[PDB]
Structure formats: C-alpha cells, structure tokens
C-alpha cells in the first residue's frame, strides 16, 4: 500500500502560493507540516509538491486534507488514463504533460494530479519542470482576472496552460512533418523510414492521451457539481473546444504521416532491376571476349598461329564487332 510507481526520484520541492485581491505571498518550502493549515483560509491557495516519490508527504497531505487513500494511490500511480473523480469535498483529476526534443525524436509524458478543496488546489508533480509558468506570472504581476476569483479559476488556468503546451507540441510536430515530408520526397533512406515510424508511434500515443483529456473536460463543463460553481463553466467549455482542435489536428497529422511512405515502400525491386541492367550488360558484353581470348590462348603450338594476317589487329577488330553487336541487340527494349 502507498507505493511509488514512477521512475522520477531525483529531487523534492514544495512551491506554495497565496494570492488575494490586494495581498499576495509565495514561498517555497521543504517541510510538509508548514503548508498544512492553508485549507481553512478563504484566500485561494495553490499547493505544489514537485516530487511525489516521497510517499510520506503525499500520505500526510492526504490524511490532513481528508482524501481517501484510493485517490492517494491513484496519485502515486503513473500508468493511468487521464480521468476525473467527483466527491463531496474534493474533485480529483489526472492529466499528463508532454515534452519533445528537436534533436532526437522522442516524446516523454508525466502525470499531474489536481485536487480542489474549498479555496485550495493541490497539484502533485513527478519532477522539476512544468508548463504553468504563465499562471505564475499572472499571479505575480497584477494581470488578468486570476486574483479576483476562487480556486476553480486556478484549476481552469492550470488546465488552460496544459492545453496551450499541447498546442506548442503540435507546432513542433508540424515542423517535423514538413521537414520529413520534404526528405521523403527527395531523400528516401532507412533513417527516413525509422523517423517516419517514430513519428507514427508518437502521434498515436498523443491521440491515446488526447481522448481521455476531452472526456475529462466534457465532464467538467457538463456535470457542474456545486464545488466548481457555474460561473467558470464557459471557460471549461472553451478548453473543451481547444481539446477538439487538438484531436482534429492529430487526426490529420496521423493521416499525412501514415500515407507518406506507401509510394517509397512499393517502389522497391525497381532498383533491383537497375542492378540487373548493369550486371547483365557487363556480363553479356565481356564474357564472350575473354572466352575467345582463352580459345585463342590455347598453348600447344599446332594452331594456325603463325604470322599470317596480323593476328592482334584482327582479334581487336572482332572484339569491336562483337561489342557493337551486343550493344545493338541491347536497348531494343530500352535497356541501360
């Protein structure tokens, strides 16, 4: 019970904010007991535990905030579909961030669990590095309407930042698709085939992540439980439509990438025919000549091998004659 499944155990950090209409405070700490009593303040809070490998902190915050151990082991689990759970006191959501490297084409995922309780949002993360910086700047620089609303708007802002990162990853994949399409158009090779297959698998993984995300946002803007408040529903509808955009784009990208490679795959053994052309033309032209060179190379001295007519020029003349006949016979059916 209460076992960590992920592979991220590098570092631990807590990053807590507290913002109101006129008063704002943000501090990073390392003791779980320090950030405990924030549930009771009417001021909206944002508790962020960056390392979930330490099961003690997760268990402590779960027991203090009174969330069932089932959602705690859901938080610990990483191989989980994105989902949302509704209860009487808290709503538990699971998302997945993504990261792409332009140098080497691989896609990495990382689960983030979101819990809303009164004017507090709890965010559990596996490692240092997130996509929620715009919300932090909006908190710290007196902009937007983030500090005039409750923790439900904070939940919105976090999810909106996540879908924005999805759009950014889509842009990177767009560039990759354009480059790879040009390459396959003019530079077909094994490395291109491997890169195309990697792009295919990355896209199908993205789509498999995309569907549960759309389900979660649909349940968010349609179920409207009393803890979310009806004021923020249109915002969740907006990000639902953004997820629709993401799904449509990944559909189109999958179609393009899957269809790229068909002509190249089917256009093989036509090169084998060219190797046939070359190998056969040299063989056919040059075997008979060495053959009759060996025929006249018989060494027993009893041939009509005297000076007679000039043997070497006559042999070279018939060399040229045979070669010309061989060339003439070829290209009749468009060889070479």
């Amino acid at each position: 019970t209460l076992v960590y499944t992920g592979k991220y155990r590098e570092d631990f950090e807590i990053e807590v904010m507290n913002y109101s209409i006129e008063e704002f405070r943000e501090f990073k700490t390392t003791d779980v007991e320090s950030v405990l009593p924030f549930r009771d303040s009417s001021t909206p809070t944002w508790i962020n535990i960056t390392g979930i490998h330490r099961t003690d902190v997760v268990q402590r915050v779960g027991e203090f905030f009174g969330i069932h151990p089932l959602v705690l082991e859901d938080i610990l689990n990483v191989h989980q579909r994105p989902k949302v759970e509704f209860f009487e006191n808290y709503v538990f959501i699971v998302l997945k961030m993504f990261t792409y490297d332009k140098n080497l084409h691989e896609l990495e995922s990382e689960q983030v669990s979101l819990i809303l309780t009164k004017n507090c949002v709890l965010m559990f993360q596996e490692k240092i590095g997130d996509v929620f910086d715009p919300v932090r700047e909006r908190i710290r620089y007196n902009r937007g309407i983030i500090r005039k609303k409750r923790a439900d708007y904070l939940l919105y802002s976090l999810i909106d930042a996540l879908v924005d990162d999805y759009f950014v990853l889509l842009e990177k994949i767009d560039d990759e698709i354009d480059v790879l399409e040009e390459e396959v158009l003019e530079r077909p090779e094994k490395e291109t085939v491997q890169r195309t297959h990697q792009l295919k698998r990355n896209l199908v993984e993205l789509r498999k992540t995309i569907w549960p995300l759309r389900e979660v946002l649909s349940s968010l803007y349609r179920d409207v439980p009393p803890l979310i408040e009806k004021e923020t529903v249109p915002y969740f509808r907006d990000v639902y439509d953004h997820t629709i955009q993401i799904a449509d784009t990944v559909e189109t990208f999958r179609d393009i990438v899957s269809g790229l490679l068909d002509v190249y795959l089917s256009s093989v053994s036509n090169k084998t025919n060219e190797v046939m052309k070359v190998l056969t033309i040299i063989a056919t032209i040059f075997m008979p000549l060495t053959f009759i060179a060996g025929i006249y190379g018989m060494n027993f001295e009893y041939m009509p091998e005297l000076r007679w007519k000039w043997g070497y020029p006559v042999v070279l003349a018939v060399m040229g004659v045979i070669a010309v006949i061989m060339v003439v016979y070829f290209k009749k059916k468009k060889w070479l």
Partner: antibody
Amino acid sequence: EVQLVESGGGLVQPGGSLRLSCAASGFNVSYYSIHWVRQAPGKGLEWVASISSSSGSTSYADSVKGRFTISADTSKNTAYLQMNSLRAEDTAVYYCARSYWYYIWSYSYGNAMDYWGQGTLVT
Amino acid sequence: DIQMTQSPSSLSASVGDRVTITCRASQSVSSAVAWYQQKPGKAPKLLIYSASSLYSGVPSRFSGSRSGTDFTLTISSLQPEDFATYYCQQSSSSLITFGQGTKVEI
C-alpha cells in the same frame, strides 16, 4: 471599392497625445480586423496594433503597449488609434490595413493584410 | 516574441533573371507567413499568404515555399515593375512581426 482613409496625422510635441482615425468604405469593420502598421522614415514595416470590432479584442506591440489604445466605431465604421506619451522614436508613417483569417491546420490560423490606406505622417 | 531574419538585405539583378529571398524564423511559425511588395512612397501590396498561396490578382511570376522554418520567395522572371522592397511577416501569434526588408535593384 474597398477603401481605407486615415486622418489625424501631423506634428505633435514630445510627451503629447494624438488620435488617428481610419475611415472604412466598401466593407463593415464589424466583420474584419483592422491593423495599424508603422514605418519609420527610412526603415522597415512595424506592426503596432489590431482590433476586432465585433469581439472588441485588442493586441498591441511591445513598443506601444500601455501607451497606445486602439478602438473602432461600428456606427461610424471607423477605427481609432489613441497615441499617448509620444516620443521622438515614434515618428513614422502610420498605415491602416484590413485583414482576413485563413486556415492552415485545425490548430493554426493566420491572417493577411489585403487593403492598405495611403498612410499618415506623425512626428 | 518571434524574430524573423530576412536575408539578403539587398539584391541586384536584371530583368528576366531568377531572384530568391529567404526568411528564417526564430522558432516555430506554422505556415502563417506572408510576403509584401512596397514600392517607394506607397502602401505595401500583398503577394503571397500561407507561405505558398498567391493572392488574387498577383502575376504567377512570384512563388513561395516553406521547408521547415525558413521561407523563400522566388520570382521566376523579373520585370521592370518588380524592383521594390519585399517584406516577411508571421501571423502565428497575436503579436505580428515583420522582416527588415529586401530591396531588389538594378
């Protein structure tokens, strides 16, 4: 038929305020987005601000953000550019342009400026 | 913010030649790149949008292309009317950014 005519240019003392107006004919500003593009004397084009009249949503360049203020009048079918805290670096030719959205993918969009006004001079 | 470097800053060629202007984006702009021609003392004129699509009324001499992040504008055969300043624009973000400009001169 589509025409954009600017007005409100001229010399202004540094640290003063000016108001540019852009009369639109042949189309309704409520259906298109209106841009202001700035060209310094002997320098390249620079985007300033954009307005979507129906939505009311604005976007300002980093250079003029906080100072400038774009607006449009649906009744007058004109767009306005309030310029405040003008500096010697803001002297340029100011253009008024009409753009349409087009489509690349389901997630990406762009816009292209078809019709431009003749421009105004502000110093 | 998007930075677009439109090089070369100047071009010299005669009528009937083939001239190309490239344009590099700082980071990912999907395809929302447009080209404008501004003869001196006049307003810019739209030539190409979506990095490859001719605007209506533009002669087929101009063409555009994209290979990843760099965008090229090419004229098949120049004309006396084609000597002007050409600009590079991105519309991927709400903050539009232009290129510094390339002048085609004899």
